[PDB]
Design a protein around this ligand. Structure first.
Ligand SMILES: [Mg+2]
Ligand SMILES: [Mg+2]
Ligand SMILES: [Mg+2]
Ligand SMILES: [Mg+2]
Lengths: 418, 418, 418, 418
């Protein structure tokens, strides 16, 4: 009947894996036939997921490094691109705190509904598409690519391999460019004294990463897969079954039956090497920015996998000015980029900008009413010199674009040619 | 069987209508028995909607005036309350541009799914409830009422009287304190030359207000009902059937069948008087903040209804400093309050704070990476002096509250007494 | 940069419009350049919407007629295809009563959230895709096309031309094959004596149809557009402004400003002819199935537009056996197909099957417990002979498909070759 | 300020626990002060959750037994009540297969978003409320209680204690009467040879049940808590840490690190006794109905806890007629009731009625068109004698109720007194 969305043959897929440099050093423990068998007889095309993943991959090789800021609303992402950023970071922490499908405010422990991040990915793409549409009818070519790739937080997948599979598939349907997956069991994090994060076995994370790659393969898009390890601070692990984890197991076992494990950079380096054949980028979660630890981690990983790119979160909570001089702060990301940290981001940038700007405005408004708003309005007028366009609020949300649709539909009215 | 949620009798409802000062000068064209007949045999209690509405009503009489800022996320509302505001305004325009259930960015023309505002009302209540929970376990009594009343945008109800009924019902279920309803048909707004907003007949808006009151009565809560008229700028009206609208009909009818109508403060004053018996507060939509025009509207309506409270939106798009001196800007709301505008707000405060703060941070970040973030962090550290708490990010989203739930559940872990 | 999703040029679009027989006799009052101007710089591919629409269009020419049953859940659609049907009808009435995003039960008056039908279209596609996936791994080739095209109810678009545009766009995103649009304002339907449905002007419905076609063109898919007229029973019309509606205007205008208008097959025929250039299929809403009336409508429209295909709803509420003999009932659709009604359906089939089957089972269960369930189970066992598979419940919902994903991910577990 | 929703004091709560027979034999390892500390300063009232839980509790003591059928849509539940059932069972399996928030069809492995069952609980209550509203305006007193209690499937809580807490809280907000929680880790279920379900430690399930009780206490409603054990068929357990589980551990450990454990009735009885102080009802999950196993399980539990009520799922997949005579089938539930199984249900009744009725209708329709629908319509007319009302479809979904609202709002129209 129809040839629309006809699946590729296993041979074609194998050929891509064998020859496209995108797949150099990418280990897949399942086969091309295994992928085809899961595709049914029609494969939906996921345009934004394909384009974003391809653009992101090229940027990670073409730019000195790719940096991003966590965005929790569509307008936040639009402003990030308008301001010149080339990628968007979709923080799971921010979604938990102010943008998830339960409607509740949550701390970061995989408490929100599992399809929440995919919904925000779709929202951000929709917002970027509107900016793109508006730019086109306005003849605005100041931004080359409105559809900046989105890198989204997949926590640990909300369950087992099938939960990770479904989350990746949903992220892709929504248009994600890349996704990160970590090796802890947040839902078992122990409170207080002698508690802390609980890691899962090294082999279980390889399963997570393998499942994430499989969902992208079945969906037929080259999604960027990022592996995150939480071994830097985690003091517990669910099981001592994996021989690669045994060197760090002390012997003490908790009431819940978990195993105490020695944390630090050593286990991060080891897990990072075990994860490398299964990840396009590796990320060592960290609490305190530390150039030496970063250097130690990257040199140890690259000694084994020289071309392995790394990802890095720049702490949003660290008191930067108190601990570092201005020059160190200014060169921090450039320095990390030289070590191979090609994707860098500040997870909670949106949470801080949103909470701070509203607190400041509201406080001034509670005290001086209109005077406080005028102060913000004047800053917005001043920002126009830098390319800010939201002072023209109707235009910003598409009133001119919808007026054009109305005009297009109205036969007694003509549209202006572009 | 169970007496949980048993409806009150028509006689009890009538007694409240007859004696509670809340209903002084409130016209209901339907009966107490009509209300009971629509309640089935169980009436769900809507705690937040009841408490919010009672609190708002008292504040409108106890404070010089109640002012608010448009909030589009839960955290935004939390900061508004933390900063000292006593009510939250939930803008439909902001929901259309960055927080509605379609996932798209839209201009203000009743384009988003009709249950969008209710979902944001529920979200803001959840967020305020979390701030309240955290405060209680922290012994923080700095904020006396975290559950600030929410006043939400009902547009024109997304259709007819039954659509307005269902939206008011959904707003109440989500915990709204008050809702506003306007007299235009946004979906038929005409673009360009000789176009403009289209009003509906005065009687149709009374139907809308009557339907919003009926839904509040059936739901057994004293929701504050606000009437907005768009007659200042509207140049069209769907029909000349209502003799109260005839003094403004020009006699011309457009190619789409709408009637040309004389706009300005005159029809606003007439509509306001016709709406007074059906609204707890009245709002004349206006493009230009102008104390004299406000005084003219206020005095004209109060000459007929001396005790009629009014609401006023302080234009977010008007170039304040270009047209008014700092003194006039500084006294603007105070002056309005003296005229009887007891509820005042800035509809797009959130849109501007969110868009501006992210553009500014992202622009600095694109240029100087971490240096830009440090600038925002320093402002946040400085704001702690004014009561800002979001710099303690984990605490802000409830990590301490959930750690307590975790500890409460763990029998081998004791909780510290509050 | 990337060429993924690059829009076609206006010249390419024009060439398709000029040469593809799909567009024979399709009037577009806007231009190819107008379409391109609204597409931004990336056009997402909508695989299911494209494939569905192409398949439906071919079926409408290849089969004697295409018939369908209203489906309100994914499993309902799966059984329709498993049973041999070639298209799925997605009723808005069923969505209002038991499957819309407000969570409430509603009558048919455009009361539910506007994105409700799109969500059910997405759901039905997901369900059919799962049946397809299961079939593929089971080697089941009994059903040739699991992805049967979906024809969905667009009501009157929930507002104006921009609301219709957004609903058509959302239906396409979800994978719809065709959508129907009607010429009434349901939200103003008048109850009781001298009341009834309210039509909108002929030109306003052409605007609706033009807007649905425009959204399909911008989304780059050949969606089947169906026009429905409610003029058989409607007694009112919003305006007498369109001279094509004037022959039916009585001259009386109601207290609400609506115009009394002569109803019946005559205005239906005139509207159908005015709509023909803007619709792939036309449907005259009718309360009484009547082959003669159908013939009269069909012949009157085809006398003007010989190749115009028509759609027909076979009334679910009409007491068939009371008014027609078994022979007439048996030949009804065949007879209609010969008149040119190429798409035929029963709108509320799902509502009736679901409500009846649960009442019957529950009633027996309340009386005789397990005996009642066994009666249904025996019917299911007997239906396996006709191809029914849901008795193997785990398999029916994909347990075998997910076991395969699990096995594919597990390197210590091999999958059996298909 | 307001006293609306003011929390009860710890002393008041303690008093209820000490004196209300509802709490006889209910162990809470946290205190009344612990509950109050988590309530913030306003407790939302959850009317439907309170009424349903109270009604369910009384029915479990007043009736010989309470039985139910799985319902996955609002109309299904309405028909169940109309047909005479006194409770509704909300199956997680059915939600996974045809009614969850991902829009996908899933097998039963906790794959769907965690707030899916709560949404269906709210939908069912909304549908029952509409039936209730319609009955009242129609003067229909044939059904005494339209708001039948809903018992919902909580799987294992989608994570740890905090995930169970949030799910229970969401079920309560939606109006649930009771919820069941099981002791397996579905997301780790192993495939094929030597695989099977994986149990969690006995103490971990006590944590789950303790967390479920805590959420109900904080929400201030007497929710019925049901504990389910999956030890009958589970062959694995995550850890051997709990001494109560050690007697069944063999010693073999799997590649994933799980422990092989001896399954059967013995471990079910042991877990059931450990769960009894934490559950209002206990349920032994089973695959094959077996009166002897049921008798053995109940007598063993009651030997320790004489007043402990039990719950029982009557297998929807067992071939009843093939293995049992008609008399045994007819007395099955009555016999179980005598053993103490006071809540009985068929989990997949809705899935079978929905899939079978649509397959049958569609198959007949594909073959004989209208004749097949007429057959269903005639059965519906015949069912009217038993009280079926859905043949009057407009009435059934509330058209008369909304017409009454329209009339109530219309001052020129009067409503008919009840
Ligand atoms: Mg996280
Ligand atoms: Mg508006
Ligand atoms: Mg309809
Ligand atoms: Mg289950």
């Amino acid at each position: 009947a129809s040839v629309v969305g006809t699946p590729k043959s296993a041979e074609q897929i194998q050929q891509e894996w064998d020859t496209n440099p995108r797949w150099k050093d990418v280990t897949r423990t399942y086969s091309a036939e295994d992928v085809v068998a899961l595709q049914g007889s029609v494969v939906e095309e996921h345009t934004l997921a394909r384009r974003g993943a391809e653009v992101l991959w090229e940027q990670l090789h073409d730019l000195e490094w790719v940096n991003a800021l966590g965005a929790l609303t569509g307008n936040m992402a639009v402003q990030q691109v308008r301001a010149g950023l080339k990628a968007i970071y979709l923080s799971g922490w921010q979604v938990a705190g102010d943008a998830n499908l339960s409607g509740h405010t949550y701390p970061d422990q995989s408490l929100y509904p599992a399809n929440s991040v995919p919904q925000v990915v779709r929202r951000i793409n929709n917002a970027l598409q509107r900016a793109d549409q508006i730019a086109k009818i306005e003849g605005d070519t100041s931004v080359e690519n409105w559809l900046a790739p989105i890198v989204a937080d997949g926590e640990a997948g909300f369950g087992g391999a099938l939960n990770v599979y479904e989350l990746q598939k949903a992220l892709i349907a929504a248009g994600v460019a890349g996704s990160h997956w970590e090796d802890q069991l947040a839902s078992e994090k122990k409170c207080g004294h002698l508690g802390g994060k609980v890691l899962i076995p090294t082999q279980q994370h390889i399963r997570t990463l393998t499942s994430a790659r499989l969902a992208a393969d079945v969906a037929d898009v080259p999604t960027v897969v990022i592996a995150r390890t939480d071994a830097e601070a985690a003091t517990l692990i669910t099981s001592d079954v994996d021989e690669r984890d045994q060197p760090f197991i002390t012997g003490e076992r908790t009431r819940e039956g978990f195993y105490r494990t020695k944390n630090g950079i050593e286990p991060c380096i080891a897990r990072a090497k075990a994860y490398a054949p299964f990840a396009d980028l590796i990320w060592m979660e960290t609490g305190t920015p530390d150039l030496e630890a970063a250097r130690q981690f990257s040199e140890a990983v690259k000694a084994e996998y020289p071309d392995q790119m790394l990802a890095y979160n720049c702490s949003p909570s660290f008191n930067w000015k108190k601990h570092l001089d201005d020059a160190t702060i200014a060169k921090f990301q450039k320095e990390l980029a030289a070590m191979g940290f090609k994707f860098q981001f500040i997870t909670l940038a949106g949470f801080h900008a949103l909470n701070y700007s509203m607190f400041d405005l509201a406080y001034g408004y509670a005290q001086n009413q209109m005077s406080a708003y005028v102060e913000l309005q004047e800053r917005e007028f001043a920002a126009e010199e830098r390319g800010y366009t939201a002072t023209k609020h109707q235009r910003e949300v598409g009133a001119g674009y919808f007026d054009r649709i109305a005009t297009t539909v109205d036969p007694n009215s003509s549209t202006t040619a572009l």
